[PDB]
Amino acid sequence: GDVEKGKKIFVQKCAQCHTVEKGGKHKTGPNLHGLFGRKTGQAPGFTYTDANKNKGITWKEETLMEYLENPKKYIPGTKMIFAGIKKKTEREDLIAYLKKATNE
Ligand code: HEC
């Protein structure tokens, strides 16, 4: 969980659709600094495509571990234009971005 790159690689490409700031009218990507509290698809106003909006759990390190680790095989594939990183563990680093954000 290298939040160092977590908040980085996150705010690098995900900063665009996921500007982590006051939620409010969400956009293509809601400030995912509360994923552990955001349903698999319950973004206020931005109700994820039936895919995430039809799950039933919350973005917990494990659930997202299945998404960030298998993004094009979990969700990141419909609108998300991302689905992998240079190496591979780069996804665990983001879990540090949220696990820390979402946590508090
Ligand atoms: C950095 C690697 C990123 C993280 C972490 C997340 N995203 Fe995104 N994202 C985008 C869209 C348009 C969607 C909706 C997909 C659809 O409509 O089918 C999403 C979805 C997510 C979700 C799902 C949360 C839920 O409740 O369903 C998570 C957890 C998430 N994203 C985290 C848009 C973009 C985007 C635009 C180009 C980027 C760069 C990212 N997302 C990157 C990340």
UniProtKB/Swiss-Prot annotation:
Transmembrane segments: none annotated. InterPro entries: Cyt_c-like_dom, Cyt_c-like_dom_sf, Cyt_c_1A/1B. It comes from the Eukaryota. It is found in: Mitochondrion intermembrane space. The modification Phosphotyrosine is found at Y48, Y97. The modification N-acetylglycine is found at G1. The keyword Membrane does not apply. GO terms for biological process: apoptotic signaling pathway; cytochrome c-heme linkage; mitochondrial electron transport, cytochrome c to oxygen; mitochondrial electron transport, ubiquinol to cytochrome c. Binds 1 heme c group covalently per subunit. Phosphorylation at Tyr-48 and Tyr-97 both reduce by half the turnover in the reaction with cytochrome c oxidase, down-regulating mitochondrial respiration. GO terms for cellular component: cytochrome complex; cytosol; mitochondrial intermembrane space. GO terms for molecular function: electron transfer activity; heme binding; identical protein binding; lipid binding; metal ion binding. Belongs to the cytochrome c family. PANTHER family: CYTOCHROME C (PTHR11961). This is Cytochrome c. It comes from Equus caballus. The gene is CYCS.
